[PDB]
Amino acid sequence: WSSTADPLSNLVLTFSTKEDAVAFAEKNGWSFDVEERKVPKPKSKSYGANFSWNKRTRVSTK
Amino acid sequence: FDNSTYRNLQHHEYSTYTFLDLNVELSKFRMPQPSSGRQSPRH
């Protein structure tokens, strides 16, 4: 079996905001690293582009 | 004038290549085709 010796291996906490998590970590004495949220950028989708008259976006199959 | 006889009898002697032979014959009457600017959508 797989053994461990530290007690905080399964500890995962959930927070609504980054500021709340930073405050919790600060008041509990832990040193933290923070990564900003990765939001997917909006795309420009168009169904008609699949059948372009002179552009490379034309599809060869459906 | 008479409706006694059938006049669509020319299609009884059509070979395998009749359609494409007619297309080849018609190829000399067509207008030049428009061009999209590329050889292919993959070009």
Side-chain angles (χ1 to χ4, degrees):
Chain A
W1 289 332
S2 147
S3 312
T4 198
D6 80 338
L8 304 172
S9 61
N10 304 290
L11 203 69
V12 175
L13 288 167
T14 303
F15 303 89
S16 291
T17 45
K18 167 184 60 177
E19 284 74 32
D20 281 303
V22 163
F24 197 83
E26 252 154 3
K27 94 182 164 196
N28 264 290
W30 292 310
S31 66
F32 52 91
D33 54 38
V34 187
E35 338 173 335
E36 316 299 323
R37 190 193 282 270
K38 300 262 204 52
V39 60
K41 52 149 40 58
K43 272 83 180 174
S44 213
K45 312 302 297 160
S46 180
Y47 186 77
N50 299 1
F51 326 102
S52 210
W53 149 253
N54 59 346
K55 314 300 276 190
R56 283 157 171 165
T57 64
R58 154 173 288 263
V59 295
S60 57
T61 207
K62 274 192 304 195
Chain B
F1 162 73
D2 49 334
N3 302 15
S4 309
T5 187
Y6 191 45
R7 318 217 98 101
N8 199 73
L9 298 172
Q10 294 84 78
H11 83 99
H12 292 191
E13 314 156 19
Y14 283 160
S15 101
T16 312
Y17 296 108
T18 298
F19 183 83
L20 294 193
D21 265 14
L22 287 160
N23 198 7
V24 169
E25 184 158 17
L26 287 174
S27 170
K28 98 214 172 193
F29 288 128
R30 323 285 209 175
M31 311 306 291
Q33 300 276 12
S35 151
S36 65
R38 324 174 177 270
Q39 295 183 359
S40 147
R42 280 131 37 82
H43 281 225

